[PDB]
C-alpha cells in the first residue's frame, strides 16, 4: 500500500548540519509527473516550504534557503535524502515528506517527526 | 510572508459556517489549482480540496469551496466533533511556490 | 480484406514523452486494420480538423499507407499549423504542403508536461537563413552569423546560438500551456493499400 516514512535524529547541535530521510512505498519516483517534497512546520505557527524533488533530476529549493539545503534521491533504495546546515534554536519544527503533482500541490503527507536545536 | 488567513472562526454544529483564506492579486490573485487540506492534532494531513469546487474519491461531499476575486473560501454543513481541527488554505503564487497559511482551528460547541 | 490487426493508435496518443518541435518523429502506420472511433472516444479536445476528407467518413476508406507526427508547441501558435500559414514556427520547424490531406489534433496538457518553475528540456529554432521546404527536419545548431562580420568558436555579439527553450508554469494564463499536437498524413486510392477499415466487398 501507498505509505510514506521519515527517519532522521531528535537532537541536533547548533554547529552540526541537520540530515533526513523518507522512503516512499507504492510508486517509483522514476515515472514521469510525480515529484517528492519536503514541509516543515515550527511550532506555533504555521508549515513551510523547503524543498522538492522531479523525476528527472530538476531541483527547486526555497527562495530563502538555497545556500543552506540539499536533497537528493536514491531510486535503487527508494529513498529521498535532505541536507541542511547552520542549526538555529528557531529550526526547531515537525517535518514530512509528501507526494507533488503538478494539479494537486500535495497529495500524501506522512507522519513526520519533530526535531530541536539545543545544547 | 504575503500571505494570511483568519485566526479562528468556531460554529454551531448543525449549521452552515464558513472559512475563509486571503491572499494577493499578485501572488495568487486569479491563478488556478487552490487547495485545501485540514490537520488533525498528531494526524498526518490528508487532502480535502484539491482544484476550485474539486474533491478526489472517498468523497465527504458536505465540504464545498469558493473562490472569490482575491481570496478562496471553505464551507462545511453539518457540524461535528470530528470537524474540531486545523484547516489550511494553499495555493501557487508567482514569487515563490508556497503556500505559508496561517490555518484556522475549528471549534465546535 | 484478408489482414486483421489493430492499429497503434494507443502507441502515439497514450506515448508519455513528446519530442522537441525542431526534431519531431514521424511513425509509419501500415498492416492494420483502422479503426476511428476510440481516436474521438476523447472528449476534450482542443481541435480536430481535417482537411481533404470529411471526418464522419473515415471508416470506410483504404489507405496507401499512414504517417503520425507528434510533438508540443505553445498555445498561441496552435493556429500556425493549417497549409498556406507563416510565422516563426511553420517557417524554421515544421511546415505543411499546400495540398496537404489528412487531419490535426490538439489538445492542451498542462497538467503533464508543466513543471513548478518551468520546464526547460523543450527547443525550439528561432534563427535560420532561409525557409524550408514541406516536411523538412533540420538538426544542425552551427553557430549562426547575423553581421557581415565572419563568427567562430562561441556566440556573443551578433553571434547567436539558433535554438531557444520553453518555460511551462502552471501560473500563465490561456495561451501558454504547452498543447500537444498530432498530425496524420496519407495518400487515397491509387496503390495495393495496407490499411483499411473493415469493409463490405
Given at each position: 500500500?501507498?505509505?510514506?516514512?521519515?527517519?532522521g535524529?531528535?537532537?541536533?547541535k547548533?554547529?552540526?548540519?541537520?540530515?533526513?530521510?523518507?522512503?516512499?512505498?507504492?510508486?517509483?519516483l522514476?515515472?514521469?509527473?510525480?515529484?517528492?517534497?519536503?514541509?516543515?512546520?515550527?511550532?506555533?505557527?504555521?508549515?513551510?516550504?523547503?524543498?522538492?524533488?522531479?523525476?528527472?533530476?530538476?531541483?527547486?529549493?526555497?527562495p530563502?534557503?538555497?545556500?543552506?539545503?540539499?536533497?537528493?534521491?536514491?531510486?535503487?533504495k527508494?529513498?529521498?535524502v535532505l541536507?541542511?546546515?547552520?542549526?538555529?534554536?528557531?529550526?526547531?519544527?515537525?517535518?514530512?515528506?509528501?507526494?507533488?503533482?503538478?494539479?494537486?500541490?500535495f497529495?500524501?503527507?506522512?507522519?513526520?517527526?519533530?526535531?530541536?536545536?539545543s545544547? | 510572508?504575503?500571505?494570511?488567513?483568519?485566526?479562528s472562526?468556531?460554529?454551531?454544529?448543525?449549521?452552515?459556517?464558513?472559512?475563509?483564506?486571503?491572499?494577493?492579486?499578485?501572488?495568487?490573485?486569479?491563478?488556478?489549482?487552490?487547495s485545501?487540506?485540514?490537520?488533525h492534532?498528531?494526524?498526518?494531513?490528508?487532502?480535502?480540496?484539491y482544484?476550485?469546487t474539486?474533491?478526489?474519491?472517498?468523497?465527504?461531499?458536505?465540504?464545498?469551496?469558493?473562490?472569490?476575486?482575491?481570496?478562496?473560501?471553505?464551507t462545511?454543513?453539518?457540524?461535528?466533533?470530528?470537524?474540531?481541527?486545523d484547516?489550511?488554505?494553499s495555493?501557487?503564487?508567482?514569487?515563490?511556490?508556497?503556500?505559508?497559511?496561517?490555518?484556522?482551528?475549528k471549534l465546535?460547541? | 480484406?484478408?489482414?486483421?490487426?489493430?492499429?497503434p493508435?494507443?502507441?502515439?496518443?497514450?506515448?508519455?514523452?513528446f519530442?522537441?518541435?525542431?526534431?519531431?518523429?514521424?511513425?509509419?502506420?501500415?498492416?492494420?486494420?483502422?479503426?476511428?472511433?476510440?481516436?474521438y472516444?476523447?472528449?476534450?479536445?482542443?481541435?480536430?480538423?481535417?482537411?481533404?476528407?470529411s471526418?464522419?467518413?473515415?471508416?470506410?476508406?483504404?489507405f496507401?499507407?499512414?504517417?503520425?507526427?507528434?510533438?508540443?508547441?505553445?498555445?498561441?501558435?496552435?493556429?500556425?499549423?493549417?497549409?498556406?500559414?507563416?510565422?516563426?514556427?511553420?517557417?524554421?520547424?515544421?511546415?505543411?504542403?499546400?495540398?496537404?490531406?489528412?487531419?490535426?489534433?490538439?489538445?492542451?496538457?498542462?497538467?503533464?508536461?508543466?513543471?513548478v518553475s518551468?520546464?526547460?528540456?523543450y527547443?525550439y529554432?528561432?534563427?535560420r537563413?532561409?525557409?524550408?521546404?514541406?516536411?523538412?527536419?533540420?538538426?544542425?545548431?552551427?553557430?549562426?552569423?547575423?553581421g557581415?562580420?565572419?563568427?567562430?568558436?562561441?556566440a556573443?555579439?551578433?553571434?547567436?546560438?539558433?535554438?531557444?527553450?520553453?518555460?511551462?508554469?502552471?501560473?500563465?494564463?490561456?495561451?501558454?500551456?504547452?498543447?500537444?499536437?498530432?498530425?496524420?498524413?496519407?495518400?487515397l486510392?491509387?496503390?495495393?493499400?495496407?490499411?483499411?477499415g473493415?469493409?463490405?466487398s
Amino acid at each position: 500500500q501507498i505509505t510514506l516514512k521519515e527517519s532522521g535524529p531528535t537532537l541536533v547541535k547548533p554547529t552540526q548540519t541537520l540530515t533526513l530521510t523518507c522512503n516512499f512505498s507504492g510508486f517509483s519516483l522514476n515515472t514521469y509527473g510525480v515529484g517528492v517534497g519536503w514541509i516543515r512546520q515550527p511550532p506555533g505557527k504555521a508549515l513551510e516550504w523547503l524543498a522538492l524533488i522531479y523525476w528527472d533530476g530538476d531541483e527547486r529549493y526555497g527562495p530563502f534557503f538555497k545556500n543552506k539545503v540539499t536533497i537528493a534521491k536514491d531510486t535503487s533504495k527508494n529513498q529521498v535524502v535532505l541536507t541542511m546546515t547552520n542549526m538555529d534554536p528557531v529550526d526547531t519544527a515537525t517535518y514530512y515528506c509528501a507526494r507533488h503533482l503538478i494539479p494537486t500541490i500535495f497529495d500524501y503527507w506522512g507522519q513526520g517527526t519533530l526535531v530541536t536545536v539545543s545544547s | 510572508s504575503a500571505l494570511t488567513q483568519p485566526a479562528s472562526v468556531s460554529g454551531s454544529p448543525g449549521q452552515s459556517i464558513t472559512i475563509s483564506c486571503t491572499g494577493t492579486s499578485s501572488d495568487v490573485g486569479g491563478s488556478n489549482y487552490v487547495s485545501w487540506y485540514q490537520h488533525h492534532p498528531d494526524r498526518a494531513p490528508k487532502l480535502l480540496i484539491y482544484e476550485v469546487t474539486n474533491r478526489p474519491s472517498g468523497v465527504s461531499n458536505r465540504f464545498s469551496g469558493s473562490k472569490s476575486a482575491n481570496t478562496a473560501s471553505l464551507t462545511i454543513s453539518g457540524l461535528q466533533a470530528e470537524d474540531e481541527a486545523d484547516y489550511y488554505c494553499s495555493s501557487y503564487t508567482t514569487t515563490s511556490t508556497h503556500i505559508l497559511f496561517g490555518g484556522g482551528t475549528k471549534l465546535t460547541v | 480484406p484478408n489482414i486483421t490487426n489493430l492499429c497503434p493508435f494507443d502507441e502515439v496518443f497514450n506515448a508519455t514523452r513528446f519530442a522537441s518541435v525542431y526534431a519531431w518523429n514521424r511513425k509509419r502506420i501500415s498492416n492494420c486494420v483502422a479503426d476511428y472511433s476510440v481516436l474521438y472516444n476523447l472528449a476534450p479536445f482542443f481541435t480536430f480538423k481535417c482537411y481533404g476528407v470529411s471526418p464522419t467518413k473515415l471508416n470506410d476508406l483504404c489507405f496507401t499507407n499512414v504517417y503520425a507526427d507528434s510533438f508540443v508547441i505553445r498555445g498561441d501558435e496552435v493556429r500556425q499549423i493549417a497549409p498556406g500559414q507563416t510565422g516563426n514556427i511553420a517557417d524554421y520547424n515544421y511546415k505543411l504542403p499546400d495540398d496537404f490531406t489528412g487531419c490535426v489534433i490538439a489538445w492542451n496538457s498542462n497538467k503533464l508536461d508543466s513543471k513548478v518553475s518551468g520546464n526547460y528540456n523543450y527547443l525550439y529554432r528561432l534563427f535560420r537563413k532561409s525557409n524550408l521546404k514541406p516536411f523538412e527536419r533540420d538538426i544542425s545548431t552551427e553557430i549562426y552569423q547575423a553581421g557581415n562580420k565572419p563568427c567562430n568558436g562561441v556566440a556573443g555579439f551578433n553571434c547567436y546560438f539558433p535554438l531557444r527553450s520553453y518555460s511551462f508554469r502552471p501560473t500563465y494564463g490561456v495561451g501558454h500551456q504547452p498543447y500537444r499536437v498530432v498530425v496524420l498524413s496519407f495518400e487515397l486510392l491509387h496503390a495495393p493499400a495496407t490499411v483499411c477499415g473493415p469493409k463490405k466487398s
